[PDB]
């Protein structure tokens, strides 16, 4: 079963390419498609896809607050934001308002596919560069987590893939994908990445 893609984009030269990359990779696939936040952020709850591709440059010059409303749906996925953005502090910001990746929409085809790949199927950790900063910007009530959702933030917080938490904890990718929210939800940790910085500052484990 290939890993679930969600795209969210009013960028058809983008969206093309996007479509073109991942119908070369036979373990990710794209399973939905919207034109506009209000759309996208609806679907994204519903299908809770491992990963959620979204364009910050969208009519209404609001993809941040777009972010924002996705952000607040309960999802177990990735969500990893494009933008022709070359201002530093706007990954920043993105990391700090829930994303788990920024991208460029100008990467060569190869290394778009790697950096797709990685999100949608891979292992993701944050660079030394960055944890720093999402740190300050990081009242966590760690025992109100049940021992599989103990068990299920240990490993989110490793970057590990639903596909290998799964298999580590012999539960289907369903389950692990309930316990991700759940486990968020308690935590008040905003994305998988927030949660392995957490995870990273207490030492918890």
Same mark, same amino acid.
């Given at each position: 079963?290939?890993?679930?893609?969600?795209?969210? *984009? *009013?960028?058809?030269?983008?969206?093309?390419?996007?479509?073109?990359?991942?119908?070369?990779?036979?373990?990710?696939?794209?399973?939905?498609?919207?034109?506009?936040?209000?759309?996208?952020?609806?679907?994204?709850?519903?299908? *809770?896809?491992?990963?959620?591709?979204?364009?910050?440059?969208?009519?209404?010059?609001?993809?941040?607050?777009?972010?924002?409303?996705?952000?607040?749906?309960?999802?177990?996925?990735?969500?990893? &934001?494009?933008?022709?953005?070359?201002?530093?502090?706007?990954?920043?910001?993105?990391?700090?308002?829930?994303?788990?990746?920024?991208?460029?929409?100008?990467?060569?085809?190869?290394?778009?596919?790697?950096?797709?790949?990685?999100?949608?199927?891979?292992?993701?950790?944050?660079?030394?560069?960055?944890?720093?900063?999402?740190?300050?910007?990081?009242?966590?009530? &760690?025992?109100?987590?049940?021992?599989?959702?103990?068990?299920?933030?240990?490993?989110?917080?490793?970057?590990?893939?639903?596909?290998?938490?799964?298999?580590?904890?012999?539960?289907?990718?369903?389950?692990?994908?309930?316990?991700?929210?759940?486990?968020?939800?308690?935590?008040?940790?905003?994305?998988?990445?927030?949660?392995?910085?957490?995870?990273?500052?207490?030492?918890?484990?």
């Amino acid at each position: 079963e290939p890993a679930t893609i969600l795209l969210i *984009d *009013d960028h058809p030269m983008l969206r093309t390419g996007v479509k073109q990359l991942i119908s070369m990779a036979p373990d990710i696939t794209v399973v939905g498609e919207a034109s506009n936040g209000e759309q996208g952020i609806e679907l994204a709850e519903s299908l *809770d896809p491992d990963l959620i591709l979204l364009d910050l440059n969208m009519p209404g010059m609001n993809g941040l607050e777009t972010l924002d409303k996705l952000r607040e749906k309960s999802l177990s996925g990735r969500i990893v &934001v494009f933008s022709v953005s070359n201002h530093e502090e706007d990954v920043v910001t993105a990391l700090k308002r829930g994303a788990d990746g920024y991208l460029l929409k100008d990467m060569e085809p190869e290394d778009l596919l790697k950096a797709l790949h990685q999100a949608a199927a891979g292992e993701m950790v944050l660079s030394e560069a960055l944890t720093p900063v999402l740190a300050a910007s990081l009242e966590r009530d &760690v025992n109100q987590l049940t021992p599989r959702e103990r068990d299920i933030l240990k490993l989110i917080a490793q970057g590990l893939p639903n596909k290998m938490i799964a298999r580590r904890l012999d539960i289907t990718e369903s389950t692990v994908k309930v316990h991700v929210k759940h486990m968020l939800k308690k935590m008040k940790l905003k994305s998988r990445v927030e949660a392995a910085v957490w995870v990273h500052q207490e030492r918890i484990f």
